Ligand binder design. Structure first.
Ligand SMILES: Cc1cc2nc3c(=O)[nH]c(=O)nc-3n(C[C@H](O)[C@H](O)[C@H](O)COP(=O)(O)OP(=O)(O)OC[C@H]3O[C@@H](n4cnc5c(N)ncnc54)[C@H](O)[C@@H]3O)c2cc1C
Ligand SMILES: Cc1cc2nc3c(=O)[nH]c(=O)nc-3n(C[C@H](O)[C@H](O)[C@H](O)COP(=O)(O)OP(=O)(O)OC[C@H]3O[C@@H](n4cnc5c(N)ncnc54)[C@H](O)[C@@H]3O)c2cc1C
Ligand SMILES: Cc1ccc(OCC(=O)N2CC[NH+](C)CC2)cc1
Ligand SMILES: [Br-]
Ligand SMILES: [Br-]
Ligand SMILES: [Br-]
Ligand SMILES: [Br-]
Lengths: 489, 487
């Protein structure tokens, strides 16, 4: 049996890796090989052909958040005159998971068919690692002593293996799960603790809250004082309130020290403070770390950062000339559309004679909390470190429809941060229904260097939440050489 | 008799913007006239204007109410279970909640007048007596009792529009959208007459709140509803309204309406077809509201179509008299009227002439599912530009394959000047289209090119990210002719 030769070998058939591979083969006529560990979603390896987003990430979680939103819809409908037997209402978690699984498997199968069909784009099943500068080895398991299925010769090698959940080293860690397992829980937990202040802990707290059985309770804990570090502070505070208002308990300044099993099999959590909580599921969502261990990068000398990601330059090049890395393995912005952009840029540069580097600034993104967040650009405290004068335009109010729905706690927040010296929009931050959809074209505006006057001169669409962004002419407050103040001196 | 810098006739979207800005920003003395202090019969519009009282604000609440018909059904695909036979839509509760919300806004504007220096409200019917005198009477009759005589350096006409009713026998047995907002019971069988956004939006409302055995029929006299919107989207929204149980009668137009013994209406179409309904709602158009103003007393010129004639700065032919909003019979939208009012006051009372830009105005239809659009449709573009590209994306979102509403295709279209890639128009149909489109209007004021959209990184998963994923034209117009490939 002979080894096979390729222009490009991609390790990991995920968001970034599939983009690079498809583009190299169909746009530039190159011969591409792509490696992944599993052909469809779920245990044992969870991620598979398609990547983390498709299998156990953005795509299934968005379907599940959509299902959870119906708890709010059924209740809010009464304000508009809808009547039905409230006592008959039930959230069938097994139906939700079965529908999600079928949707994901359909994507798996379509990717499989693309590889069966496409000239110069071949898929290989197994664990990829680096043997030498131009040879990728595919083995039966992550163990480098397992059996060799293929050796793939490669002029260019792309590392795109993504990331993996981080688990803290506490006694009883084996009694806990990550988001990987949460996507497959046979029944919805009556009592659940989600550990983390980031978007995965927050999104899953919303999902469990809607599908919990009658006696249930969702608790989210976070070791620092305020969840969702990195997001707008006003939005961090408001989303805490609105999660609380929908019945989720938020323990800040709290962190599990150990977990043990009660005699009935439930989980007994002891926090560092000495507080205790009994739950049926503990889901760790304290971070995600780049997947480098199995690549045997020592074989060729690819340098990692102190933090643990593959080091790259602006063009995704490692320190070995023909080996590149994109996506979560670079441990920067862990977002599917960033990985895709990096992949397309790398291939245009290497095979297309059109050099291009990904712009990591002013990237629009979202949190599918209930209600959701949409953001693009700098938060005000970051901007105030870089610009002498920063203005903040802010609108926050309960929309009229939620005075009828009864969910009066649902304040819509719109904030615009500027460089006041010339009006350039530095960031936009949104909380409320529709915020992920509103923010997308805001990203185009920021890439065009929009100023606040470009927003204000635009005529609103009425009635919308989005029109608040085009009705703000006077700053609410300022930062002058880093100091917050209602007025310029 | 009383003396003012500015008298505004009509306390509406445009009128209140102009009055409040003139008083608070420029310290002027301002009087504002309207015929009613809160919403509803007999004059329907009131303090706040058409949008506030019988327009955008109440209709959006009612469309939101109607969407729950879809949400309740669609929840089953995501595992929600409940007794479907127990579901009912209480129209009276909807109307009561809507009434309370509107009345709250009415009261708020009252307090605004009480709290603001130089801003006075006068109740009654205003008309032009002389070039610098506005009269306020008890009724629309120009011979009813005078209540006030207000002299003004400047007069602003801002009385809005009114529903157009065709001259057919039995027109008096039909209603308009004014009365639709106050029907005691939801009509079981209703015909909405017209192809425009008001007919289409109310059709969706009645469709959700109709009693058992109900049916909503929309008729329109030409071949395809929603003239002036993107043609792909006109065809799709037709298809998706039909999938939700609404009957679309095209190429049909009422010829007469007559009363039945049971109180329902017998409609005879020009074609000879007949239909018995409980309610006939005419929504064929809205015309400028000029007849009670006595414009002949001063000679304000009208256009052939009936709007007050204005230049780009909202000035009539009579010095010191201005017209903004629906009375100018241009774009009939609340944010356009507001923009016009503000530009006018900045021009007259500040040192800064400003004129409203009527191109590239974003707007929406709250049909189910809704439309959001900004800028030019492709067949208008193809008459102004030698080479036009159309980028098109149309699919059913994954969530509606699970929800069971598989007919709900999302549509996104971008229209460009292909010679330089300048985005001329963007057109959207699907959940969230009105929210998605707002920042697109800002893009068009930065002379965004198609490559500016495509080079922006998407937010995933959203419908909106479709706008940043289109590289290759679907087809073109060259010298006005549609073709799949360039020559
Ligand atoms: C719960 C959750 C929700 C998320 N939600 C969002 C969201 O809403 N929006 C968003 O933009 N992002 C979201 N993300 C992030 C998104 O999933 C990632 O940023 C993106 O998938 C990373 O793309 P990538 O190409 O780096 O790798 P991935 O998509 O992770 O693909 C890497 C692939 O490599 C395979 N692999 C690993 N090691 C090997 C090996 N040795 N040999 C062969 N194959 C290997 C893996 O099986 C996997 O398929 C979410 C992530 C999670 C975990
Ligand atoms: C059903 C419906 C739905 C709509 N939905 C939308 C939407 O979603 N978005 C949107 O942008 N637009 C919408 N519109 C349009 C919007 O309502 C109008 O464009 C806007 O209200 C016009 O503002 P204006 O300043 O011209 O006058 P208006 O807001 O109409 O105010 C005119 C006022 O003048 C008063 N008046 C009239 N004659 C006299 C007189 N002789 N003396 C004293 N007072 C007088 C009236 O009582 C009224 O209050 C909708 C309209 C309707 C009918
Ligand atoms: C289980 C369920 C879900 C949604 C529902 O909305 C009402 C509906 O379906 N209508 C169509 C028929 N009309 C005569 C009345 C309005 C009703 C039941
Ligand atoms: Br269940
Ligand atoms: Br401005
Ligand atoms: Br018609
Ligand atoms: Br037509």
């Amino acid at each position: 049996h002979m080894s096979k030769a390729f222009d490009l070998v991609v390790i990991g058939a995920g968001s970034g890796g599939l983009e690079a591979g498809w583009n190299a083969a169909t746009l530039y006529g190159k011969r591409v090989a792509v490696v992944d560990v599993q052909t469809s979603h779920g245990p044992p390896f969870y991620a598979a052909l398609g990547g983390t987003c498709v299998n156990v990430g953005c795509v299934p979680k968005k379907l599940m958040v959509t299902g959870a939103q119906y708890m709010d819809h059924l209740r809010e409908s009464a304000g508009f005159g809808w009547e039905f037997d409230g006592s008959s209402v039930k959230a069938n978690w097994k139906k939700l998971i079965a529908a999600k699984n079928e949707a994901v498997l359909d994507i798996n199968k379509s990717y499989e068919g693309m590889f069966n069909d496409t000239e110069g784009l071949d898929f290989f099943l197994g664990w990829g690692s680096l043997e030498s500068k131009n040879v990728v080895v595919v083995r039966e398991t992550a163990d480098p002593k397992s059996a060799v299925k293929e050796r793939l010769q490669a002029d260019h090698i792309l590392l795109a293996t993504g990331s993996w959940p981080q688990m803290p080293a506490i006694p009883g860690i084996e009694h806990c799960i990550s988001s990987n397992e949460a996507f497959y829980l046979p029944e919805p937990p009556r009592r659940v603790l989600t550990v983390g202040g980031g978007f995965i802990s927050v999104e899953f707290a919303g999902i469990f809250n809607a599908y919990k059985p009658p006696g249930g309770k969702v608790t989210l804990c976070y070791r620092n004082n305020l969840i969702l570090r990195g997001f707008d502070e006003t939005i961090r505070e408001e989303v805490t309130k609105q999660l609380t208002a929908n019945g989720i308990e938020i323990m800040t300044n709290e962190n599990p020290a150990k977990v043990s099993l009660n005699t009935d099999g439930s989980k007994h959590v002891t926090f560092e403070s000495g507080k205790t909580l009994d739950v049926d599921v503990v889901m760790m969502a304290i971070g995600r770390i780049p997947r480098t261990n199995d690549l045997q990068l020592g074989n060729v000398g690819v340098k990692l950062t102190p933090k643990g990601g593959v080091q790259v330059d602006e063009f995704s090049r490692t320190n070995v000339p023909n080996i590149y890395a994109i996506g979560d393995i670079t441990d920067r912005l862990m977002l599917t559309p960033v990985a895709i952009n990096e992949g397309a840029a790398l291939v245009d540069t290497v095979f297309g004679n059109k050099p291009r580097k990904t712009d990591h600034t002013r990237v629009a993104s979202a949190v599918f909390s209930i209600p959701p967040i949409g953001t693009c650009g700098l938060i005000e405290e970051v901007a105030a470190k870089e610009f002498e004068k920063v203005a903040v335009y802010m609108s926050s109010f309960t929309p009229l429809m939620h005075n009828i729905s009864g969910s009066k706690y649902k304040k819509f927040v719109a904030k615009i941060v500027t460089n006041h010296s010339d009006g350039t929009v530095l960031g936009v931050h949104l909380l409320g229904d529709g915020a992920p959809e509103i923010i997308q074209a805001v990203g185009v505006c920021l890439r065009l260097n929009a100023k606040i006057s470009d927003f204000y001169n635009t005529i609103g669409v009425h009635p919308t939440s989005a029109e608040e962004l085009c009705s703000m002419r006077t700053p609410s407050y300022y930062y002058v050489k880093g100091e917050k103040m209602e007025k310029l001196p």
